[PDB]
């Protein structure tokens, strides 16, 4: 249900702002974390609501959340170029919609484009080198490419969601954030995703293939 699936969407942002308000004793990457989820969270709310108005919102309420985490976690030089990063985000997945992208490829890219961020801003946090950085770059900018061209079915993007969240949730590990910590928000972003590919099912042209 539509209504049913918003509710616990916004029941998730709620949860998500919740956790990320209790940050005064949480590290630079717990932070990090927190606010990539609630990004995630937020661009998935909008894709699944699909009104203009909405998008204007959560856009704000995504870029606010992203300075405020920034200024907090002495990061302030990078709060313009993030910004451009969120709003480039959300454009593109308004474009997505309008070109008639699949919702199956619009969710991946989506969280895709999130994880790129939340790993560039964690390694900066964390004082990796340029080429480090780089690595990772080039590797998930190759990885998008081949999981758009694969992704053509809600059982193909599921598949690809899990394998998404497996690796990146190793690379969070890697950076040093506790793997049970970690696991516990990209099994939110993973329900939240789940959530919007049952949308679609029942848009206007997927009842018309279910009634005929
Ligand atoms: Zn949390
Ligand atoms: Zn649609
Ligand atoms: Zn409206
Ligand atoms: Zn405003
Ligand atoms: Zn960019
Ligand atoms: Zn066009
Ligand atoms: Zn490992």
């Known amino acids: 249900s539509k209504e049913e699936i918003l509710e616990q969407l916004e029941k998730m942002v ?5 956790e990320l308000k209790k940050a005064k004793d949480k590290s630079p990457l717990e932070l990090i974390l927190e606010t990539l989820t609630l990004i995630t969270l937020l661009s ?3 894709i699944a609501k699909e009104d203009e108005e909405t998008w204007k919102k959560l856009l704000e309420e995504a870029l606010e959340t992203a300075e405020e985490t920034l200024k ?5 030089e990078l709060i313009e170029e993030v ?3 969120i709003k480039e985000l959300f454009d593109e997945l308004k474009k997505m919609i309008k070109e008639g992208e699949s919702k199956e490829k619009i969710i991946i890219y989506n ?3 999130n994880f790129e961020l939340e790993i560039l801003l964690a390694m900066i946090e964390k004082g990796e080198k340029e080429e480090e950085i780089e690595k990772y770059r080039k590797k998930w900018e190759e990885k998008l490419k081949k ?3 694969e992704v053509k079915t809600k059982e193909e993007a599921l598949k690809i969601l899990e394998e998404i969240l497996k690796e990146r949730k190793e690379e969070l590990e890697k950076l040093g954030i506790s793997k049970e910590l970690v696991e516990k928000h990209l099994e939110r ?3 939240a995703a789940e959530l919007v590919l049952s949308m679609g099912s029942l ?3 997927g009842l018309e293939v279910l009634f005929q």
Do not use: C, H, Q
Request: without cysteine; hydrophobic residues 40%; charged residues 45%.
């Open 72 to 76: 907090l976690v002495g990061l302030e």
């Open 44 to 46: 998935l709310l909008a």
């Open 203 to 205: 848009e206007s042209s």
């Open 14 to 18: 709620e949860e998500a702002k919740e």
């Open 111 to 113: 969280i895709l484009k």
């Open 147 to 149: 999981y758009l061209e």
């Open 189 to 191: 972003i993973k329900k």
């Open 83 to 85: 910004k451009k990063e």
